[PDB]
Design a protein around this ligand. Structure first.
Ligand SMILES: Cc1ccc([C@@H]2C[C@@H](C)CCN2C(=O)c2ncnc3[nH]ccc23)o1
Length: 167
């Protein structure tokens, strides 16, 4: 039993809710919140900008030190950093950004990072300002992630479409 509330169950291990991931993280304090990161960990907008704003920019400060030491992530890759006031840990995962021309096949590699964590609160990777079809992202999630994932979808209209079209 865990504290996630109000989710629709899609499969054995994937759950979905119309929610603001920032507000959901603030209430649940999950072990892991996933950030929709880029390779530079520049948290300017979308989910990343919102998560970073909620940490009062502490996420960005920590991320800049990470990059200065380690260099950029790979598209499809991830790193574990602090969850600050939102979660124990933040798993920064880089899905391909279609608006930069990155290969959508890398979306499966991106979701594979979730399998290193037993339970996660997450957005749909490569959705929103990353330009991919969220219906496709949900399909890849379900077919790739084997651990327990709680997906927060900010847009109510999109949430209803994802549910109604789910196979
Ligand atoms: C066109 C459009 C607008 C928004 C989005 C994306 C994808 C859709 C499918 C879900 C919501 N989205 C997020 O990025 C998101 N999700 C959860 N919590 C968030 N908090 C701040 C942003 C945010 O796409």
């Amino acid at each position: 039993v865990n504290s996630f509330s109000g989710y629709l169950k899609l499969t054995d291990n994937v759950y979905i809710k119309n929610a603001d991931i920032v507000e959901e993280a603030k209430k649940v304090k999950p072990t892991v919140v996933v950030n929709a990161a880029n390779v530079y960990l520049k948290h300017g907008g979308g989910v990343a900008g919102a998560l970073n704003k909620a940490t009062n920019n502490a996420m960005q400060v920590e991320s800049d030190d990470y990059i200065a030491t380690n260099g950029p992530l790979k598209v499809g890759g991830s790193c574990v950093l602090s969850g600050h006031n939102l979660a124990k840990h933040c798993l920064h995962v880089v899905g391909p950004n279609v608006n930069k021309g990155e290969d959508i096949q890398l979306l499966k590699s991106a979701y594979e990072n979730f399998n290193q964590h037993e339970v996660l609160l997450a957005p749909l990777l490569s959705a929103g300002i990353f330009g991919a079809d969220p219906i496709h992202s949900l399909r890849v999630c379900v077919d790739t992630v084997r651990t327990n994932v709680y997906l927060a979808v900010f847009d109510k209209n999109l949430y209803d479409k994802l549910v109604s079209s789910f196979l």
